Ligand SMILES: *[C@@H]1O[C@H](CO[C@@H]2O[C@@H](C)[C@@H](O)[C@@H](O)[C@@H]2O)[C@@H](O[C@@H]2O[C@H](CO)[C@@H](O)[C@H](O)[C@H]2NC(C)=O)[C@H](O)[C@H]1NC(C)=O
Ligand SMILES: *[C@@H]1O[C@H](CO[C@@H]2O[C@@H](C)[C@@H](O)[C@@H](O)[C@@H]2O)[C@@H](O[C@@H]2O[C@H](CO)[C@@H](O)[C@H](O)[C@H]2NC(C)=O)[C@H](O)[C@H]1NC(C)=O
Ligand SMILES: CN(C)CCNC(=O)c1cc2c(cnn2CC2CCCCC2)cc1Cc1ccc(F)cc1F
């Protein structure tokens with residue numbers, strides 16, 4: 001029996017057998033007043049103590065959110081949908097400490113992704129019990145608000161200021177500062193890590209001053225704030241807020257009266273109208289996301305980055321080979337998870353209209369120009385592979401590289417990886433490759449479980465990734481010093497070296513997607 005006393009009360013953990021060892025899990029610790037009733041849309045209010053022993057023995061409610069209904073029954077897409085009840089009462093976090101209780105352990109804090117509209121910390125692929133067991137780090141994850149309930153913004157108006165989901169996270173980071181010492185964790189050695197919108201959330205904590213003192217280092221997996229889907233403009237955020245007010249009858253004229261009106265609508269009514277607040281939509285459409293609120297973010301983050309105004313520390317940043325493929329079966333004509341999705345120039349051109357709806361005819365032509373100079377015109381998958389690369393280079397790879405370039409320029413160590421291993425278990429078709437989101441199980445040491453059908457080569461690759469991530473977290477340097485591993489160079493805006501992760505040879509390469517990213521980063525922004 002194990003009971004930790006937090007500043008707000010006592011909490012009872014539970015015991016987990018992992019790899020002939022024992023990990024203690026604390027699942028579902030409240031970290032704020034439930035944002036219910038008059039607290040909907042407002043910032044997370046601090047929590048009143050409890051006298052009891054909170055039985056943090058089961059994952060808490062996931063936050064309200066629309067569910068991806070594109071592949072019922074299919075574990076490839078369903079493994080990402082929430083696996084506890086949805087509920088506005090969802091501000092909870094989890095703690096995996098190694099047993100025997102550590103003394104002064106590095107803390108890893110996981111922020112999930114999901115387009116800022118979806119996600120939950122209780123996913124099987126976010127299970128921190130492995131990392132605690134193998135590397136004796138403490139893993140913490142939290143649920144934060146998503147969609148309108150977590151990112152609605154009427155600027156200046158505390159009734160709905162924006163970035164509430166980000167403030168949810170930041171209140172969790174602070175819970176860890178005030179409480180993790182009781183769990184055997186060193187609040188002075190905290191590494192934020194996250195994926196996709198999680199990764200972009202991590203970058204926004206580097207920029208936000210109120211986060212400066214809540215963490216030590218940062219890890220950005222397939223995502224950063226300068227990604228085109230990541231920050232909403234103050235204009236759009238109001239249009240999207242008001243358009244939502246029409247669709248729900250809640251359109252008033254006193255702004256606060258509008259918010260008053262939405263607080264009395266049902267979570268399902270708000271959930272069901274979010275989709276239409278944009279006039280056109282793409283599969284990469286963050287309807288309600290981060291904005292420049294003058295509280296969490298003081299200015300347009302693209303400026304803060306450019307002018308060095310961020311927490312000075314080490315970052316580890318990477319992306320997956322085929323970031324873009326998953327999105328093609330959510331709309332692109334001629335694509336399917338269930339055939340080889342060979343497509344034509346005309347199908348290719350039509351999918352550009354799908355993925356860049358507001359872009360001029362010449363913008364769409366320029367994308368076709370820079371991705372169809374076929375080295376070999378014979379290949380039939382030319383246009384299929386091109387579109388995946390379009391979406392992946394524009395939405396994920398290039399913004400990650402540009403962020404690492406820019407952030408390293410102010411003198412901090414940065415390490416870049418390129419994950420190129422396709423899971424031996426992966427349930428999606430082969431034309432999709434190394435998909436967005438499918439390094440996460442390797443980062444969390446799930447292949448370390450030999451009773452899971454992963455190959456032995458995958459066991460090692462996970463084992464090495466878990467070592468590298470932990471060393472980065474403890475000592476700001478992501479090396480695997482013992483097993484004669486390939487050393488991981490720092491990323492310098494000059495030479496731009498990165499590490500490839502794979503089951504065969506881990507190599508050191510240079511200037512990833514240089515041709516493609518000069519286009520996306522210098523030309524295309526101007527069209
Ligand atoms: C700001 O919002 C208006 C309104 O959008 C319409 O109403 C919403 C509730 C939602 O259902 C949208 O799809 C609606 O279109 C936008 O103006 C609309 O623009 C679209 C573009 O296709 C047009 O078809 C509609 O008829 C327009 N309706 C009105 C009332 O103007 C406007 O474009 C939005 N601004 C931005 C920057 O997105
Ligand atoms: C690949 O499949 C797509 C998707 O269509 C569905 O999936 C198939 C596996 C099969 O069950 C189809 O009958 C399904 O409808 C096909 O795209 C369709 O293509 C036809 C003709 O090309 C067109 O009328 C439809 O509008 C398309 N629908 C969608 C949703 O894209 C595509 O033709 C298949 N291509 C190859 C090369 O196999
Ligand atoms: C990385 N994790 C975050 C993976 C989780 N799902 C997605 O990221 C995703 C979601 C998508 C789309 C297009 N529309 N929606 C709708 C969402 C958002 C709003 C309400 C309905 C649900 C595309 C993708 C990309 C995607 C899908 C499956 C997958 F295996 C890996 C992936 F990369």
Ligand SMILES: *[C@@H]1O[C@H](CO[C@@H]2O[C@@H](C)[C@@H](O)[C@@H](O)[C@@H]2O)[C@@H](O)[C@H](O)[C@H]1NC(C)=O
Pocket residue numbers: 001012055
């Ligand atoms: C919280 O849990 C208390 C003790 O839990 C029970 O006993 C221990 C030894 C374990 O076996 C555990 O799995 C058992 O459930 C309960 O006595 C107490 O009522 C619980 N409080 C709640 C659920 O509010």
Ligand SMILES: *[C@@H]1O[C@H](CO[C@@H]2O[C@@H](C)[C@@H](O)[C@@H](O)[C@@H]2O)[C@@H](O)[C@H](O)[C@H]1NC(C)=O
Pocket residue numbers: 103104186188189474
């Ligand atoms: C815990 O340790 C604190 C300082 O050490 C920290 O850990 C190492 C790994 C580095 O990241 C370093 O920067 C950190 O400062 C002490 O101040 C603290 O009192 C220690 N507490 C206990 C209970 O051991």
Ligand SMILES: *[C@@H]1O[C@H](CO)[C@@H](O)[C@H](O)[C@H]1NC(C)=O
Pocket residue numbers: 254255256257
């Ligand atoms: C809007 O309504 C609120 C709630 O009564 C009120 O306090 C606020 O001052 C109003 N503002 C205007 C401009 O009418």
Ligand SMILES: *[C@@H]1O[C@H](CO)[C@@H](O)[C@H](O)[C@H]1NC(C)=O
Pocket residue numbers: 460463464467480483
């Ligand atoms: C190093 O190699 C041994 C086998 O010689 C393996 O059991 C161990 O876990 C490895 N550690 C890593 C890759 O971090």
